[PDB]
Amino acid sequence: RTYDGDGYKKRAACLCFRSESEEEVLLVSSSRHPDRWIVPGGGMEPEEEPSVAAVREVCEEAGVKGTLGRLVGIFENQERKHRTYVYVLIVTEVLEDWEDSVNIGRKREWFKIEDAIKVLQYHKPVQASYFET
Ligand SMILES: O=P(O)(O)O[C@H]1[C@H](OP(=O)(O)O)[C@@H](OP(=O)(O)O)[C@H](OP(=O)(O)O)[C@@H](OP(=O)(O)O)[C@H]1OP(=O)(O)O
Ligand SMILES: [Cl-]
Ligand SMILES: [Cl-]
Ligand SMILES: [Mg+2]
Ligand SMILES: [Mg+2]
Ligand SMILES: [Mg+2]
C-alpha cells in the first residue's frame, strides 16, 4: 500500500466504457459482499504512475484492456481515508479468464450509466459521484 502525505491511501480506477459513446460502463462484484457492485480499481504501487495503476487494476479486477482516455478527477473517501485517480478507458479487449475471476470468482457486468449510478449509491456514493460530470 502507498499513501499521500496526509495518510490517505493512493488508488486508481477506470470508468470502463464499451465505446467512445460512453453510454455503458463495466462494474465488478465487491470482494467482501459479492451481491454488490463497485468500480474496478485499487492501490497504486511504489513509484507507479496513476494511469499505469488504473490500467493494471482494471486488467486484474475486470479482465479488460483498451484505450486509456482522460483523467476525470481525483476523489476522496473520508471514512476509509483513500484518494482515487479516476480515468476513462474505452474497452477494446475482453478476456475470458482474469486474475480475480480465477482467484475469488469476481463477476463483471455492463450497466447503462444511469443504472451504474443507481447500484453504486447505497454502499459506494463516492463511486456514483465519479459519473456526475
Ligand atoms: O474493507 P472492505 O469494506 O472489504 O473494503 C475493501 C477495502 O476498501 P476500504 O479501504 O474502502 O475499506 C480494500 O482496501 P484496504 O482497506 O484493504 O487497503 C479495497 O482494496 P483496494 O483499495 O486495493 O481496491 C477492497 O477492494 P477489492 O478487494 O475490491 O480490490 C475493498 O473491498 P470492496 O471490493 O468490497 O470495495
Ligand atoms: Cl458505450
Ligand atoms: Cl469509494
Ligand atoms: Mg480493488
Ligand atoms: Mg485490486
Ligand atoms: Mg487491491
Curated annotation (Swiss-Prot):
Cofactor dependency: Mg(2+); Mn(2+); Zn(2+)
GO biological process: adenosine 5'-(hexahydrogen pentaphosphate) catabolic process; cell-cell signaling; diadenosine hexaphosphate catabolic process; diadenosine pentaphosphate catabolic process; diadenosine polyphosphate catabolic process; diphosphoinositol polyphosphate catabolic process; diphosphoinositol polyphosphate metabolic process; RNA decapping
GO CC, one annotated term: cytosol
Broad EC category: hydrolase
Active-site residues (renumbered): E60
Consequence when changing F75Y: Induces a strong decrease in Ap6A and [PP]-InsP4 hydrolysis, while it only weakly affects PP-InsP5 hydrolysis
Entry's cofactor comment: Binds 3 Mg(2+) ions per subunit.
Effect annotated for changing G43 to A/V: Loss of diphosphoinositol polyphosphate phosphohydrolase activity
Keywords from the named record: Acetylation, Cytoplasm, Hydrolase, Magnesium, Manganese, Metal-binding, Nucleus, Zinc
Regulation acting on activity, per entry: Endopolyphospahatase activity is inhibited by NaF, NaPPi, beta-glycerol phosphate and heparin. 5-diphosphoinositol pentakisphosphate (5-InsP7) inhibits its mRNA decapping activity.
Protein EC: 3.6.1.52, 3.6.1.61, 3.6.1.10, 3.6.1.62
Coarse class of the protein's main subcellular location: cytoplasm
Ligand binding (Mg(2+) 1): G41, E61
Residues engaged in binding Mg(2+) 2: E57
Binding positions (Mg(2+) 3): E57
Compartments, as annotated in UniProt: Cytoplasm; Nucleus
Binding site for substrate: R1, K9, K10, R11, S30, S31, R32, R80, K81, H82, R106, K124
Top-rank taxon: Eukaryota
Outcome recorded upon mutating H82L: Induces a strong decrease in Ap6A and [PP]-InsP4 hydrolysis, while it only weakly affects PP-InsP5 hydrolysis
UniProt short sequence motif Nudix box, positions renumbered to this chain: 42-63
Catalytic activity: diphospho-myo-inositol polyphosphate + H2O = myo-inositol polyphosphate + phosphate; 5-diphospho-1D-myo-inositol 1,2,3,4,6-pentakisphosphate + H2O = 1D-myo-inositol hexakisphosphate + phosphate + H(+); 3,5-bis(diphospho)-1D-myo-inositol 1,2,4,6-tetrakisphosphate + H2O = 3-diphospho-1D-myo-inositol 1,2,4,5,6-pentakisphosphate + phosphate + 2 H(+); [phosphate](n+1) + n H2O = (n+1) phosphate + n H(+)
UniProt subunit comment: Monomer.
Role this protein plays: Cleaves a beta-phosphate from the diphosphate groups in PP-InsP5 (diphosphoinositol pentakisphosphate) and [PP]2-InsP4 (bisdiphosphoinositol tetrakisphosphate), suggesting that it may play a role in signal transduction. InsP6 (inositol hexakisphosphate) is not a substrate. Acts as a negative regulator of the ERK1/2 pathway. Also able to catalyze the hydrolysis of dinucleoside oligophosphates, with diadenosine 5',5'''-P1,P6-hexaphosphate (Ap6A) and diadenosine 5',5'''- P1,P5-pentaphosphate (Ap5A) being the preferred substrates.
Family named by the database record: Belongs to the Nudix hydrolase family. DIPP subfamily.
Full protein name: Diphosphoinositol polyphosphate phosphohydrolase 1
Source species: Homo sapiens (Human)
Range covered out of full length: 10 to 142 of 172
